[PDB]
Amino acid sequence: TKTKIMGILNVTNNVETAINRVKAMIDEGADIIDVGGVSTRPGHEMVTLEEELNRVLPVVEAIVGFDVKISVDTFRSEVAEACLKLGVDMINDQWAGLYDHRMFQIVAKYDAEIILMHNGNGNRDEPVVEEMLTSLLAQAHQAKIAGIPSNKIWLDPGIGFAKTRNEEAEVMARLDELVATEYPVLLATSRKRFTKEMMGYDTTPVERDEVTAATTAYGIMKGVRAVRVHNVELNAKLAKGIDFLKENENARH
Amino acid sequence: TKTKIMGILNVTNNVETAINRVKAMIDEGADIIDVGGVSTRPGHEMVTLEEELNRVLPVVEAIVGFDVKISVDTFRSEVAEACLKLGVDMINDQWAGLYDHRMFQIVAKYDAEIILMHNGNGNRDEPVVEEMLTSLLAQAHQAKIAGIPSNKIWLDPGIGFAKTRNEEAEVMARLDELVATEYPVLLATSRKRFTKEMMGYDTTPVERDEVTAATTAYGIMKGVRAVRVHNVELNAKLAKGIDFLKENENARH
């Protein structure tokens, strides 16, 4: 199967603008739209449950009927339920169900998919790759206990979260170890610090699109199943090419 | 070391235009400029020694002094020699020394590099990858006899030449086998039929830049050492990213 291209729709006329952006992203090759109004990055805006519902629901309501998968980026089970009632396909939980333990039961109740992201405050007693795998496998198992099938549980290594520069480099060197869990892996590096380190000199975020695309190609070669990206068209065409080359290689061995 | 980015400079005022385009390519990250004024496709033109010299020399004189290596795409030893006494660094021979066997002596005499491209009629007894290796290893041997160091003998699989669609796919599936000869490999796919097939639905040549860049990433992952491309910026930035990811991976294992 194709590598899935997940476009980013931040929702922090708004509904109209978002409808137009979603249509453009579909035309550019998105398979999934990741809708969110809230961040867990240190120094994030403080957004209450009521404000999160206020910003996300009118958008989700307007876009869920398009022929694309809708992922809602939320860690709050009440937000996820309200969106799942409207027909969204996936919950992208930056806390891997650790913030709200009802998230699993909710996702299972609507037969939807969940993405579990590696996160934390940076402290850990084990090396990062071990701690990541251990943490994420244990939360995936909590998801399974609740009734979600393994094929609907995605893992995200959480580049941008709970890791030093050296720890992110270690993760990005060892993506195969996360893919080997057999849960589908979502790589989300787009324009983050790791891509700044790849460029090696000062850039605007948009200028990090080519190196982001290199992480897409590399990741796909390591067997990640989706990429979450700002520049949908570049990554969709790159990924189309990499999928084609991998399939061709497979077919011929 | 980095993957080398070879920009394409075709030649048909013309010197000034060539000067400006080479300045742009150096700025976009080109390490080598490939200058050619003659094609070896069946669907391409016929050009005399004197005509080729008239086109190639003025451009080469004007550009050789800039901060970039110059490769001259020619199969004539006379053109090669004229450009080498002017200080170009490489000869990219689309006939791999088979059209003019003096080519080896001449590159050796000037301490330069040679690229040997797989080419032919399309006729062959043995399967394509075997015939490609046999022909290229034999021509590389001739180059070694002439005094050319093995690290200065490049192999190009010749996508676009002497091969059916299926044969090109077979080659593109098996680039690791060409890399395993330990001669540095130049991959040259940019905007060719192979990239047309990767996009599938109708495209112009320029619409093929993103899948060309996929071949760049894939090739680098397979160990090719340079890519020959129309869109220097996109490939340079992407290849910088893939080089970074591979080095990172290697350092951490």
Side-chain angles (χ1 to χ4, degrees), chain A, chain B residues 1-44 46-50 52-253:
Chain A
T1 82
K2 65 176 299 192
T3 309
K4 307 309 176 54
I5 311 306
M6 180 188 279
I8 293 171
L9 183 74
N10 291 321
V11 295
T12 65
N13 217 34
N14 291 15
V15 171
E16 222 58 45
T17 301
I19 283 167
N20 288 337
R21 192 31 190 166
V22 163
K23 289 180 181 200
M25 288 186 275
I26 287 165
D27 286 341
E28 287 181 52
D31 300 291
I32 310 168
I33 313 289
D34 193 51
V35 190
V38 305
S39 179
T40 65
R41 217 171 157 286
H44 66 91
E45 181 192 4
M46 300 173 310
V47 174
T48 63
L49 169 55
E50 197 84 79
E51 301 170 75
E52 188 176 356
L53 290 166
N54 286 347
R55 305 159 171 195
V56 167
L57 298 183
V59 173
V60 168
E61 182 167 37
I63 66 175
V64 74
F66 304 141
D67 198 2
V68 68
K69 299 173 61 151
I70 300 306
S71 173
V72 177
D73 204 311
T74 188
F75 49 76
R76 293 200 265 226
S77 65
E78 308 100 324
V79 181
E81 182 157 33
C83 293
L84 295 169
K85 281 189 186 160
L86 294 168
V88 306
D89 308 281
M90 330 178 78
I91 300 304
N92 188 356
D93 183 342
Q94 283 175 43
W95 283 115
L98 288 172
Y99 182 101
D100 183 345
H101 191 244
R102 303 164 290 168
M103 186 70 80
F104 296 126
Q105 291 157 240
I106 285 304
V107 166
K109 176 182 180 190
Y110 298 94
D111 297 307
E113 297 173 271
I114 195 164
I115 308 154
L116 302 177
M117 193 188 82
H118 187 239
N119 209 338
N121 60 24
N123 287 343
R124 51 175 59 86
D125 298 331
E126 270 61 60
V128 66
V129 176
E130 176 189 356
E131 188 263 329
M132 172 186 74
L133 296 175
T134 298
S135 168
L136 289 182
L137 292 168
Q139 293 298 100
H141 180 57
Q142 295 294 315
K144 288 203 296 205
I145 294 320
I148 313 178
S150 325
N151 75 300
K152 296 186 185 283
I153 299 163
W154 293 67
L155 305 183
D156 175 348
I159 307 306
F161 303 82
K163 300 180 269 290
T164 65
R165 290 167 172 89
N166 175 62
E167 287 175 315
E168 286 188 350
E170 188 75 11
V171 173
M172 288 299 293
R174 293 168 63 185
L175 294 170
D176 54 306
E177 293 173 40
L178 185 61
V179 167
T181 64
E182 312 173 277
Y183 293 109
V185 171
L186 172 67
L187 186 58
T189 60
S190 189
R191 309 179 172 170
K192 290 171 174 182
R193 192 197 53 202
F194 186 80
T195 64
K196 288 170 105 144
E197 303 287 308
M198 293 171 72
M199 289 293 268
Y201 59 79
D202 293 298
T203 47
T204 57
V206 182
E207 282 177 330
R208 305 168 205 156
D209 278 349
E210 291 84 352
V211 287
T212 294
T215 73
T216 289
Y218 178 77
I220 295 168
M221 294 293 283
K222 300 297 187 187
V224 314
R225 285 270 302 285
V227 292
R228 176 181 185 274
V229 291
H230 292 91
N231 186 332
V232 171
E233 183 179 16
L234 176 61
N235 288 282
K237 289 178 184 176
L238 194 67
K240 174 180 191 180
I242 298 290
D243 292 344
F244 186 94
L245 293 160
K246 285 182 79 187
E247 293 309 293
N248 182 58
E249 183 182 338
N250 287 344
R252 284 158 195 284
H253 293 81
Chain B
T1 325
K2 78 179 288 181
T3 305
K4 295 142 154 263
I5 311 299
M6 177 180 287
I8 296 165
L9 186 69
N10 289 326
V11 300
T12 297
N13 67 47
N14 306 334
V15 174
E16 281 164 324
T17 295
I19 290 171
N20 295 330
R21 179 56 184 161
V22 166
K23 298 297 185 83
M25 301 198 266
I26 298 174
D27 186 59
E28 290 181 45
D31 298 298
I32 308 170
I33 313 295
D34 193 52
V35 180
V38 181
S39 166
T40 69
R41 296 189 202 279
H44 276 146
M46 292 226 73
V47 181
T48 70
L49 179 50
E50 172 183 23
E52 192 181 349
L53 290 182
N54 271 146
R55 282 178 206 162
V56 176
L57 296 183
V59 171
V60 164
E61 298 190 343
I63 64 174
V64 81
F66 304 150
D67 189 18
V68 65
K69 280 161 46 80
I70 306 305
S71 169
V72 182
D73 210 303
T74 176
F75 55 78
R76 296 179 164 114
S77 67
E78 300 96 335
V79 178
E81 175 153 53
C83 294
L84 292 166
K85 47 157 195 41
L86 302 183
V88 307
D89 304 77
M90 330 177 75
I91 299 302
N92 178 6
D93 187 348
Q94 288 180 45
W95 286 118
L98 292 158
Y99 176 89
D100 185 358
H101 182 263
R102 294 175 298 181
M103 185 72 78
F104 295 129
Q105 303 165 28
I106 290 297
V107 169
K109 171 173 177 194
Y110 292 87
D111 232 87
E113 296 179 74
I114 189 168
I115 306 147
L116 305 172
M117 193 184 86
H118 185 242
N119 203 348
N121 248 331
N123 276 42
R124 55 179 55 80
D125 310 318
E126 302 292 13
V128 65
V129 178
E130 266 170 61
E131 184 272 323
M132 172 179 71
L133 285 163
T134 295
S135 173
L136 293 179
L137 291 171
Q139 295 309 101
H141 181 63
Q142 290 304 125
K144 293 206 278 202
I145 295 311
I148 306 163
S150 93
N151 60 305
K152 296 189 185 174
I153 295 163
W154 293 73
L155 300 188
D156 176 343
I159 301 308
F161 298 85
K163 304 173 207 52
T164 65
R165 174 185 61 258
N166 198 51
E167 286 173 324
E168 290 189 355
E170 189 71 14
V171 169
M172 283 303 294
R174 292 172 64 187
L175 291 175
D176 54 312
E177 297 176 38
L178 186 63
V179 169
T181 63
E182 309 178 78
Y183 296 111
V185 173
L186 174 70
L187 182 60
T189 61
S190 181
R191 303 189 179 164
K192 290 170 169 166
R193 181 213 62 74
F194 187 82
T195 68
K196 179 164 51 56
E197 184 186 347
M198 297 170 70
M199 283 298 284
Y201 54 79
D202 285 339
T203 56
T204 57
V206 175
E207 286 167 338
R208 301 171 200 158
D209 283 344
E210 290 90 348
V211 294
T212 291
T215 72
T216 295
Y218 179 76
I220 296 165
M221 291 303 284
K222 298 297 187 190
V224 312
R225 298 299 282 127
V227 295
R228 182 178 184 276
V229 294
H230 293 92
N231 184 335
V232 174
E233 184 178 83
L234 173 58
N235 288 282
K237 290 184 159 160
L238 190 91
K240 179 172 165 186
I242 299 289
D243 286 351
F244 183 94
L245 296 159
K246 291 178 65 166
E247 189 280 344
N248 180 52
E249 180 182 335
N250 287 334
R252 293 178 174 277
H253 294 85

